[PDB]
Amino acid sequence: SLPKTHELHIFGSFNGVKFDMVGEGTGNPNEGSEELKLKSTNGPLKFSPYILVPHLGXAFYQYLPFPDGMSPFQAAMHDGSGYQVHRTIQYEDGASVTAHYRYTYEGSHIKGEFQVIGTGFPPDGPVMTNKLTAMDWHVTKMLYPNDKTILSTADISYTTTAGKRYQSKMRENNTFAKPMAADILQKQPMFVFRKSELQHSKTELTFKEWQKAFTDVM
Amino acid sequence: KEEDNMASLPKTHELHIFGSFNGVKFDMVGEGTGNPNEGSEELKLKSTNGPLKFSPYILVPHLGXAFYQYLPFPDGMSPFQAAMHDGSGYQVHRTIQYEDGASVTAHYRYTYEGSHIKGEFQVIGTGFPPDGPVMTNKLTAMDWHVTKMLYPNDKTILSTADISYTTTAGKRYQSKMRENNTFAKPMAADILQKQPMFVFRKSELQHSKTELTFKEWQKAFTDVMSGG
Amino acid sequence: SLPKTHELHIFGSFNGVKFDMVGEGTGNPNEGSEELKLKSTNGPLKFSPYILVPHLGXAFYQYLPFPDGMSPFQAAMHDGSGYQVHRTIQYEDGASVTAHYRYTYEGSHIKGEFQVIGTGFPPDGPVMTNKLTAMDWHVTKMLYPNDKTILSTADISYTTTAGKRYQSKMRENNTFAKPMAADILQKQPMFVFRKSELQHSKTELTFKEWQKAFTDVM
Amino acid sequence: ASLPKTHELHIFGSFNGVKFDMVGEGTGNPNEGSEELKLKSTNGPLKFSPYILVPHLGXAFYQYLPFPDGMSPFQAAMHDGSGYQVHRTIQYEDGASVTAHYRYTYEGSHIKGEFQVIGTGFPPDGPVMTNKLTAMDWHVTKMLYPNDKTILSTADISYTTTAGKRYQSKMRENNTFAKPMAADILQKQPMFVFRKSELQHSKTELTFKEWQKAFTDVM
């Protein structure tokens, strides 16, 4: 059956200090946005919640359709074989994040685990002092270097209270236990347009992702 | 008024593109036309100094990027078009970093008289491995690509692009462009309010050793359309 | 108390397939000429054990002195405040590894946990087809962007069976719960010369690292 | 056939578009790999950090660098007349990059270097263009020989700044020789070079000094 609901556990550390959040959502019946609510299990977050946005967004691959048919993410969910996501992000001020996502799927329920580790954020920078205000709309580019691996890249920027954007470069591999279907492999690059909205308090967050795959705009 | 301004933009151009790859000079010239309302252009080039030692695909980002005068924005003239219209002008500088450690520095300038542009593109590449796909002519096509544009101040557009090529071996060759466009006069406030701006680009190249024919289609967009 | 004994649990996945190894050994904090014997708790590794070597080597930071006294690593082991290692490695053929090390220290015995995730290794490349033959000697460069953070970088190359080399770029943060002594922060950059040897079977591996800190050679 | 006593250098090109030029001269000791250069801008004072030129003053004269067991391949190729070319790219933490091409001709113990250096993408507000670089950290070059005519080198280069943060860069270089290097050279890989670079300056002139020492080990 198609996925209905999801839970997400997102956890790890930033500048050596642990964080952990759990939440969940119900999948969107009608192709607009996907949504998730989270709560901290270990006190208020000591870094900008906006830093989690690419992980929150990216945790919705099971809902992302492709233009002509099922995405590989949907196809691998449906057959049981699965995928994992591994990614690095480099920040313009020298900071680094690494992350890994795995999930299980039983009934119509997805349980995701996203480990997120960040280091080297300057203590007076926009992440550790909570100066990010939003993440810019962005494009993922996807290429298929082999039949079980998607290489995805994204240039991701955030607005700040200083009116200077904060920029980063994401590279990710999505690894499939079984080969992707021949027809998926014929349309490259594949792009994804993403709009990410976050509402936040110190301890809780509400998140929405609009995500749409395209091979063309003309 | 809007239509008059678009109508007055130039429709012909010539390009002189030159420099060197791995320390060996090259130089090509030619011309073509373009359509500034539609985001489309054509260019034909010939070497003025013998066959190219390197894949002509390595020049494609520079060939596409020479024609900002042909890029309209969704709501009206792009800043490039506006700066040509009011005679104030802009310049283009960029670097590309390649997956195998090679690097390209490039600079474009132009002179604009009547309805004609004369463009000058200096392209300097180094560190291309002698056995790699550029020095051995193994690039077969450039994948459609997206440019992301930001305006850190009212006289600067900073662009980034993830640019890839297919190779005869069937493995893509990947590159990252960073571009800075500097404007003499401030861009209009309405341009500046809509960031980031993306451009979708489709590039076709037919080449032989001595000449090439190039076409590019470009379309600016802030978002993709809903539905389908 | 000076440490004398260690164990290392080193685990994760390569191209999506899990691995897990444990081993132990001993060492000298007065030198840095250290050894470890490891065995898989699963079956045989499906990738080149040479790819583990920077992680094996780096797990001996507690045995590394500095020229004029204790390294920060040693100091934080002794006062008990500790440190964590987060690193990323990019490979010439596009593959990527992320890894995180933490440890607990009781008696004179170090217990290390090194999580290592690699993706995007071409299935015909030298890592997945076991063609790495040795790791070249190398230099780590260390900077201290702030008083709890070391940024290390290294250009690491391996020889292969085909008379060629296979190259990688490592970037790592070492994050300390307490600040590093001011004497340590005035001497930058600090370099570390490393010599790595591995003997390995399906059945196990034996690893040795020679590490020496230096500010200068002339 | 000779090793070097004297040299001169014409270093030119542009940063963020605008052309710079300088000519200069000095000396070294090819037995200890030390080298000293005085030069002056020839097109008016530098409009960016002179520290950004330092890898291209330091690395410029590999003919002064001995190897631990004898002549470096750079020394060797000077001596036997066959020569070599240097091509170098440097990538900066803030996305700027430089491309550089060094070419040499010799008369006896006298080197005349011609180096083209083109930098683009330096933020106008960053430490290169506003002259905030205060020193180049000492650094280690790594060299490998993927064939008997090529040295590929890499270096992680950092500078101190007046903001108190370091500004980092990565250099990659290809040294191409017209004749094969000696078998003993190719056998000791990687080779490292420790380099100390020092600048004292004015608006006419500046004084650059480089200590360079090849090493395969420290233990």
CSV table of C-alpha atoms in Angstrom, one decimal, chain C:
chain,number,residue,atom,x,y,z
C,1,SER,CA,47.0,8.1,34.4
C,2,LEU,CA,48.8,7.2,31.1
C,3,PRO,CA,46.7,4.9,28.8
C,4,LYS,CA,48.2,1.5,28.0
C,5,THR,CA,45.4,-0.6,26.4
C,6,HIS,CA,42.6,0.2,23.8
C,7,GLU,CA,39.8,-1.3,21.9
C,8,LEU,CA,38.1,0.0,18.8
C,9,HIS,CA,34.7,-0.8,17.5
C,10,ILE,CA,34.8,0.4,13.8
C,11,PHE,CA,31.6,0.0,11.8
C,12,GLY,CA,29.1,1.5,9.3
C,13,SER,CA,28.6,0.8,5.7
C,14,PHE,CA,30.2,1.0,2.3
C,15,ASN,CA,28.0,1.6,-0.7
C,16,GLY,CA,25.0,0.7,1.5
C,17,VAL,CA,26.3,-2.6,2.9
C,18,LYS,CA,27.0,-2.7,6.6
C,19,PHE,CA,30.3,-3.8,8.2
C,20,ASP,CA,31.4,-4.2,11.8
C,21,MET,CA,34.8,-4.9,13.3
C,22,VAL,CA,36.3,-4.9,16.8
C,23,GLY,CA,39.9,-5.1,17.9
C,24,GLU,CA,42.3,-4.0,20.5
C,25,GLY,CA,45.9,-3.4,21.3
C,26,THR,CA,48.4,-1.2,23.2
C,27,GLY,CA,50.6,1.8,22.9
C,28,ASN,CA,53.1,4.4,24.0
C,29,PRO,CA,51.8,8.1,24.8
C,30,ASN,CA,55.6,9.0,24.9
C,31,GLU,CA,56.0,8.1,21.2
C,32,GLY,CA,53.0,7.2,18.9
C,33,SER,CA,54.1,3.8,17.5
C,34,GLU,CA,50.8,2.0,18.0
C,35,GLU,CA,49.1,-1.3,17.1
C,36,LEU,CA,45.7,-2.8,16.7
C,37,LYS,CA,44.4,-6.2,15.8
C,38,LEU,CA,40.9,-6.2,14.3
C,39,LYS,CA,38.5,-8.9,13.2
C,40,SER,CA,35.0,-8.6,11.5
C,41,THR,CA,32.1,-9.5,13.7
C,42,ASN,CA,30.2,-10.3,10.4
C,43,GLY,CA,31.9,-12.0,7.5
C,44,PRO,CA,34.7,-10.9,5.3
C,45,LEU,CA,34.9,-7.2,4.3
C,46,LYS,CA,33.5,-6.5,0.9
C,47,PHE,CA,35.8,-3.6,0.3
C,48,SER,CA,39.5,-2.8,0.6
C,49,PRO,CA,40.5,-2.7,4.2
C,50,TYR,CA,43.0,0.1,3.2
C,51,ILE,CA,40.1,2.5,3.1
C,52,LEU,CA,39.8,2.1,6.9
C,53,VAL,CA,43.3,3.2,7.4
C,54,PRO,CA,42.9,6.9,8.1
C,55,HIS,CA,40.3,6.0,10.7
C,56,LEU,CA,42.4,3.3,12.3
C,57,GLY,CA,45.3,5.8,12.5
C,58,UNK,CA,43.4,8.7,13.7
C,59,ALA,CA,41.9,6.6,16.5
C,60,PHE,CA,45.4,6.8,18.2
C,61,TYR,CA,45.3,10.6,19.0
C,62,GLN,CA,45.5,9.8,22.8
C,63,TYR,CA,49.0,8.4,22.2
C,64,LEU,CA,50.2,11.5,20.3
C,65,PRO,CA,52.5,13.9,22.1
C,66,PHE,CA,53.4,17.4,20.9
C,67,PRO,CA,56.9,18.6,20.5
C,68,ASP,CA,57.1,20.6,23.8
C,69,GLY,CA,54.6,18.5,25.9
C,70,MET,CA,51.1,17.1,26.0
C,71,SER,CA,48.9,17.3,22.9
C,72,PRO,CA,45.4,18.6,23.4
C,73,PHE,CA,44.2,15.1,22.9
C,74,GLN,CA,46.3,13.8,25.8
C,75,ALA,CA,45.4,16.7,28.1
C,76,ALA,CA,41.6,16.1,27.5
C,77,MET,CA,41.9,12.4,28.1
C,78,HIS,CA,43.5,13.1,31.5
C,79,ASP,CA,41.3,15.8,32.8
C,80,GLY,CA,38.4,13.6,31.5
C,81,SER,CA,36.7,16.3,29.4
C,82,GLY,CA,37.5,14.6,26.1
C,83,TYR,CA,37.0,15.3,22.4
C,84,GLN,CA,35.2,14.0,19.3
C,85,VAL,CA,36.4,13.6,15.7
C,86,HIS,CA,34.2,14.4,12.7
C,87,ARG,CA,35.7,14.0,9.3
C,88,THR,CA,34.8,13.9,5.6
C,89,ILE,CA,37.0,12.4,2.8
C,90,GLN,CA,36.4,13.0,-0.9
C,91,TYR,CA,38.0,10.6,-3.4
C,92,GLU,CA,39.3,11.2,-6.9
C,93,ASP,CA,36.6,9.1,-8.4
C,94,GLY,CA,33.8,10.9,-6.7
C,95,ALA,CA,33.2,8.7,-3.7
C,96,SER,CA,32.7,10.2,-0.2
C,97,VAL,CA,33.2,9.0,3.3
C,98,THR,CA,32.1,10.6,6.5
C,99,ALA,CA,33.1,9.4,10.0
C,100,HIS,CA,32.7,10.2,13.6
C,101,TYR,CA,34.8,9.1,16.5
C,102,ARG,CA,34.1,9.2,20.2
C,103,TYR,CA,35.5,7.4,23.2
C,104,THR,CA,35.2,6.6,26.9
C,105,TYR,CA,38.2,6.1,29.1
C,106,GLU,CA,38.2,4.0,32.3
C,107,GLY,CA,41.3,2.7,34.2
C,108,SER,CA,44.1,3.1,31.7
C,109,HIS,CA,41.8,1.6,28.9
C,110,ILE,CA,40.4,3.5,25.9
C,111,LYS,CA,37.2,2.3,24.4
C,112,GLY,CA,36.7,3.9,20.9
C,113,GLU,CA,33.7,3.9,18.6
C,114,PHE,CA,34.4,5.0,15.0
C,115,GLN,CA,31.4,5.2,12.7
C,116,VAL,CA,32.4,5.2,9.0
C,117,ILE,CA,30.0,5.7,6.1
C,118,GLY,CA,31.2,5.5,2.5
C,119,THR,CA,29.2,5.9,-0.6
C,120,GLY,CA,29.6,6.5,-4.3
C,121,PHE,CA,32.6,4.1,-4.8
C,122,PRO,CA,32.4,2.8,-8.3
C,123,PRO,CA,31.7,-0.9,-8.2
C,124,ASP,CA,34.7,-1.5,-10.5
C,125,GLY,CA,37.0,0.9,-8.7
C,126,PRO,CA,40.0,0.0,-6.6
C,127,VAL,CA,38.1,0.2,-3.3
C,128,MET,CA,35.3,-2.1,-4.1
C,129,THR,CA,37.6,-4.6,-6.1
C,130,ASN,CA,40.4,-4.6,-3.5
C,131,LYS,CA,43.2,-3.2,-5.6
C,132,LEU,CA,44.7,-0.9,-3.0
C,133,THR,CA,48.2,-2.0,-2.0
C,134,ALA,CA,49.6,0.4,0.5
C,135,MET,CA,49.0,3.9,1.9
C,136,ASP,CA,51.6,6.5,1.2
C,137,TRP,CA,53.2,8.3,4.2
C,138,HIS,CA,51.4,11.6,4.9
C,139,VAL,CA,51.2,14.9,6.6
C,140,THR,CA,48.3,16.2,8.6
C,141,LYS,CA,48.1,20.0,8.8
C,142,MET,CA,46.3,21.3,12.0
C,143,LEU,CA,44.9,24.8,12.7
C,144,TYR,CA,42.9,26.0,15.7
C,145,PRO,CA,40.1,28.3,14.4
C,146,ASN,CA,38.9,28.6,18.0
C,147,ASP,CA,39.9,27.3,21.4
C,148,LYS,CA,37.7,24.2,21.3
C,149,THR,CA,38.3,23.3,17.6
C,150,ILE,CA,41.0,21.7,15.6
C,151,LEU,CA,40.6,21.8,11.8
C,152,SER,CA,42.9,19.2,10.2
C,153,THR,CA,43.4,18.5,6.5
C,154,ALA,CA,45.4,15.8,4.7
C,155,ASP,CA,46.1,14.8,1.2
C,156,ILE,CA,46.1,11.0,1.3
C,157,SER,CA,47.2,8.7,-1.5
C,158,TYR,CA,47.3,4.9,-2.0
C,159,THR,CA,49.2,2.7,-4.4
C,160,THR,CA,47.2,0.3,-6.4
C,161,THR,CA,48.1,-3.0,-8.1
C,162,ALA,CA,48.1,-1.3,-11.5
C,163,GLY,CA,51.2,0.9,-10.9
C,164,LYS,CA,48.9,4.0,-10.3
C,165,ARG,CA,47.9,6.0,-7.2
C,166,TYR,CA,44.4,6.6,-5.8
C,167,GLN,CA,44.0,10.0,-4.1
C,168,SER,CA,41.7,11.5,-1.5
C,169,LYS,CA,41.3,14.8,0.5
C,170,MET,CA,40.4,14.6,4.2
C,171,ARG,CA,39.0,17.4,6.2
C,172,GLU,CA,38.2,17.0,9.9
C,173,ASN,CA,37.2,18.8,13.0
C,174,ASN,CA,38.2,17.7,16.5
C,175,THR,CA,35.9,19.2,18.9
C,176,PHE,CA,36.8,19.6,22.7
C,177,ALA,CA,34.4,19.9,25.6
C,178,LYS,CA,36.9,22.2,27.2
C,179,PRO,CA,39.2,24.7,25.8
C,180,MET,CA,42.7,23.9,24.7
C,181,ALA,CA,45.7,25.3,26.7
C,182,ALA,CA,46.9,28.6,25.4
C,183,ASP,CA,50.4,27.3,24.9
C,184,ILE,CA,48.9,24.8,22.3
C,185,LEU,CA,47.0,27.6,20.5
C,186,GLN,CA,50.1,29.7,19.9
C,187,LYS,CA,52.0,27.1,17.9
C,188,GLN,CA,50.2,26.8,14.5
C,189,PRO,CA,50.1,25.2,12.2
C,190,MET,CA,51.0,21.9,13.8
C,191,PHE,CA,51.9,19.1,11.4
C,192,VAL,CA,51.8,15.4,12.1
C,193,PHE,CA,53.8,12.9,10.0
C,194,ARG,CA,52.1,9.5,9.7
C,195,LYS,CA,53.2,6.1,8.6
C,196,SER,CA,50.6,3.5,8.2
C,197,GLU,CA,50.9,-0.2,7.7
C,198,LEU,CA,48.3,-2.8,7.4
C,199,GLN,CA,48.5,-6.6,7.1
C,200,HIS,CA,45.1,-8.1,6.4
C,201,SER,CA,43.2,-11.2,5.6
C,202,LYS,CA,39.5,-11.9,5.2
C,203,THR,CA,40.0,-13.4,8.7
C,204,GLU,CA,41.4,-10.2,10.4
C,205,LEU,CA,43.8,-7.3,10.3
C,206,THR,CA,46.9,-6.0,12.0
C,207,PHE,CA,47.6,-2.4,11.8
C,208,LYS,CA,50.4,-0.1,12.8
C,209,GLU,CA,50.7,3.6,12.9
C,210,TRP,CA,53.8,5.7,13.6
C,211,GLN,CA,52.8,9.3,14.3
C,212,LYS,CA,55.0,12.3,15.0
C,213,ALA,CA,54.0,16.0,15.6
C,214,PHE,CA,56.2,18.7,14.2
C,215,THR,CA,56.2,22.5,13.8
C,216,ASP,CA,59.2,22.6,11.4
C,217,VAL,CA,61.9,20.4,9.7
C,218,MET,CA,64.8,22.9,9.2
